[PDB]
Structure formats: structure tokens, C-alpha cells
Design a protein around this nucleic acid. Structure first.
Lengths: 158, 222
DNA sequence: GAAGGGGGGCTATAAAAGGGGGTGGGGGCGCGTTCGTCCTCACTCTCTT
DNA sequence: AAGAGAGTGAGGACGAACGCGCCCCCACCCCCTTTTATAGCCCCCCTTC
């Protein structure tokens, strides 16, 4: 109950932590937190605004030691991808990790798929799937006023 | 003559030996090879009314050690050895004590400083860290200890309700081993549900109040 | 041996069944301290002598 | 006019009481299983280079 309450409190304050992030600090598994999470909402008759990709960009990018410009590009890419519906049904965390990977690969500070997965809590396979969906529209997603250390046409393909 | 007997023959012969205090570097050089059978020569010079003891380091070993004697009348010292075959013997009695000192004074401290620095290598100090650690409490769907325990419980499964006759036979058979059993311990032996086991135990067994630890079940119905 | 892909598993969602196991809330009594009752003793009067 | 016994003051060991737990037992709930469609996520294993 406490772990689920902590998750709700983070959502209600506009700084969501993913269920895995809350689980990593609690002996309770993610499955049980989700079970108590839904029960608490029913009991309290409350609701939490749906999380977005940008709700995790600051924490993820900061935890990855990525510059501010990479974080700004990563936020722009993820929001644009959702706006363009390039990743329908994908979890926002998966999109955020993939967006971070695309922006990271396009800058001097390059982070591997494994690195982003560990901080983001998303398997590199999941990041690979989401990244593959947005890779085709890479030039459109990147911010217009973005400096590419590695040209968009030469981004990793996989 | 026995295993614990001490071969005091050395004492009978009144053999004399010298006790010498030497620094580690001199012994460390000896410990380097320690199998060549030679580390130096001990030179003793005596005059009409004065005696001096000095030691010279081997040239190969290096790639003056003056000796100062000490009075031995204030304490009596003896040397004994224990044989690997459990045969203790007395080598002899110490007749003189000597100490080794370094010929050099200034540059000698330099070697000592290196030793002090060398012995300071295991001395661990806190390390400043440029970037805050971000690898702790990494997101995880479930802790490794939790899934392993969950997997074990699933594989083992819940205990089943065995027939009363088989459960009764096991209970009576185990009764011979000890007079009384704890309910928790008895469950492990019988491997039956607690509620089901309690009902069977109640049907025949009873619990007696013991003033030493607590009231425990007694397998004897009467 | 590193890396990608295929197959397979986890999760929620309802609903019912019957029962083992975990857990929280009370109940039970054994053992390390604490104080008053009991018991022992040094220095002066008293009944018996 | 003088012995044992005693009053009084006074010190020292011991039992019942008081806590102060640690263990236990009895409600209460959850979980197990089965079916099904759905889609994403994730893990184990196989294969290519």
C-alpha cells in the first residue's frame, strides 16, 4: 500500500516515477504495486493524469550525464513522435528511452542501448523496437535548431 | 622417554649461542634468495682491552653493519626447537646479545620512508567522486531474491491432504523418536496442512501445559 | 564469443469453485531485577540465683 | 550482690511481586487453478557472423 501510495504521490505532483523505479526502492514487486495502485484509486475515488514522455526526460537524461541540448532534443523527438503517432500503443517510457537513444547517438555524448535501458528500466529489445519505428522520420523529429555531431542520415540503423 | 619429553642434551653441553637483533631490510634481502647458502661474513675484531663486532653485506646480495653487544646478566635466555616429528630439543643457552645498526644516517631514512610509504598502500582513503552515482536502485520489475523464492514455492507447491490412516501412521511412528513434539516441527515431519494436521492431532492427541517453555502437544492420546 | 531474432512467458479483465499458507491482532507464561520480611549480631538491664 | 536471657539498635541474605519481554494461537484475507480475446513488455533459447 505504501509503495503504491508513493507512486501515486509522485504522479499527483507532476514528477512520475515508473513502476520499476518505485519497485527498485521497495521489497514489493512491480506486479503487487500495480495491484494496490488500482485499488487505491478506487478507494479514494481519485485519478492521476496520464504520464507523458517528457515526464521522464529530465531524470533519465540527468542520470545518463547527457547535456541539456541532448535532453531538449530527446524531449522534442519523443513529443513529436507521439504527436505524429509513430509509436501507437507503445509505453511512454519505451518511447522516451528510444527518443533519448536517437538524440544521444546524434551528439558527442553517445549512450549505448544497454545504458539507457538500465536507467530507463526498459529492455534494450524494447528500446530497439520503438527506435526502429521512429528512425525513418528522424530528420522530422529532431529540433530544427539542433547541431548534429553525427548527421541524421548516418544515425545507427537497426 | 615419551612424546612430551624434552631433549635437554644441549643444556648439558652448555653450548653457547648469540642473540642478534637485525632490521627487516637485511633479513628481507636474505629472504629474497634464502637458498644460496650464503648471505655475508661476520667479522669480529678484538684488541687488548676492547672488542668490536661488525657485519659486511654480500656484494651480490646488495645488488657496513656494526654490531653492539648487550649485557645478558639481567635475564637468562635459552633456545629450544620443536621437531616436526614431535621431538622437542634444547639447542643451547644464550651467552651474549647483540644489535645491528645502520652505517649511514641520512640516506638510510630514505629507505625507511619508502617502507613507511610501502606499508601505507593498504591504508585506504576516501575517494572524491566527480559524478554522483546513478547506478543504485536501478529500475527492476522484480527483485532477484523475490522471483527465486517465488519460483521455489511454485515448484514445491502447496501441501496436500493425505489420507488419515497414512498421516496417523507417520505420527505414531515418529512418536517413538521423542516423547513430545512442537506443532510447527511436527508439521515439517508429517508435511500436512496445519488445519488438517491439528484436526487429526485433536482427534487423538492432546496438549499439556509445561512450565519450562510453553504448552506443547503430546503425541500420547492419554 | 557478440549480437539479433524466434519462441515462449507475464500482465490485466471478468467470474465461480475449495482449501493451504501468510499475516495481524490478541493471549499466554518464563526469566532478569527490586523491596520488605526474615534472620544474625555488638553493647547494656533484668530475673533468677 | 553476680550468671543467662533479653531489648534495642542495627546490618545482611532470601522470596514474592513487578515488569518485560518472546513465543504462540485464532480470525481474516489472498493465493492457487482453469478458460478466452486482446497488445505490449520482457526472458530464455537458438542461430548467424
Amino acid at each position: 500500500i505504501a509503495s503504491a501510495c508513493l507512486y501515486i504521490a509522485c504522479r499527483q505532483e507532476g514528477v512520475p516515477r515508473t513502476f520499476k523505479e518505485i519497485c527498485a526502492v521497495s521489497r514489493i514487486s512491480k506486479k503487487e504495486i500495480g495491484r494496490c495502485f488500482k485499488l487505491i484509486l478506487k478507494a479514494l475515488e481519485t485519478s492521476v493524469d496520464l504520464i507523458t514522455t517528457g515526464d521522464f526526460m529530465s531524470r533519465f537524461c540527468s542520470n545518463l550525464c547527457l547535456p541539456k541540448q541532448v535532453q531538449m532534443a530527446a524531449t522534442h523527438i519523443a513529443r513529436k513522435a507521439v504527436e505524429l503517432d509513430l509509436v501507437p500503443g507503445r509505453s511512454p517510457i519505451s518511447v522516451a528511452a528510444a527518443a533519448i537513444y536517437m538524440a544521444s547517438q546524434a551528439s558527442a555524448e553517445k549512450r549505448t542501448q544497454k545504458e539507457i535501458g538500465d536507467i530507463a528500466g526498459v529492455a534494450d529489445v524494447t528500446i530497439r523496437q520503438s527506435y526502429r519505428l521512429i528512425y525513418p522520420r528522424a530528420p522530422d523529429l529532431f529540433p530544427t535548431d539542433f547541431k548534429f555531431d553525427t548527421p541524421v542520415d548516418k544515425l545507427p540503423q537497426l | 622417554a615419551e612424546r612430551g619429553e624434552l631433549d635437554l642434551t644441549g643444556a648439558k653441553q652448555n653450548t653457547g649461542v648469540w642473540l642478534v637483533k637485525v632490521p627487516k631490510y637485511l633479513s628481507q634481502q636474505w629472504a629474497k634468495a634464502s637458498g644460496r647458502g650464503e648471505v655475508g661474513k661476520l667479522r669480529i675484531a678484538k684488541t687488548q682491552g676492547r672488542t668490536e663486532v661488525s657485519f659486511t653485506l654480500n656484494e651480490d646480495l646488495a645488488n657496513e653493519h656494526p654490531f653492539v653487544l648487550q649485557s645478558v646478566g639481567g635475564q637468562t635466555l635459552t633456545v629450544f626447537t620443536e621437531s616436526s616429528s614431535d621431538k622437542l630439543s634444547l639447542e643451547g643457552i644464550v651467552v651474549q646479545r647483540a644489535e645491528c645498526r645502520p652505517a649511514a644516517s641520512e640516506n638510510y631514512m630514505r629507505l625507511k620512508r619508502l617502507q613507511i610509504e610501502e606499508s601505507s598502500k593498504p591504508v585506504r582513503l576516501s575517494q572524491q567522486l566527480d559524478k554522483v552515482v546513478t547506478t543504485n536502485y536501478k529500475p527492476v520489475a522484480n527483485h532477484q531474491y523475490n522471483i527465486e523464492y517465488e519460483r521455489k514455492k511454485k515448484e514445491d507447491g502447496k501441501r496436500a491432504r493425505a489420507d488419515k490412516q497414512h498421516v496417523l501412521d507417520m505420527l505414531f511412528s515418529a512418536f517413538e523418536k521423542h516423547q513430545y513434539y512442537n506443532l510447527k516441527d511436527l508439521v515439517d515431519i508429517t508435511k500436512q496442512p496445519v488445519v488438517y494436521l491439528k484436526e487429526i492431532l485433536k482427534e487423538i492427541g492432546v496438549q499439556n501445559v509445561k512450565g519450562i517453555h510453553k504448552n506443547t502437544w503430546e503425541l500420547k492420546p492419554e
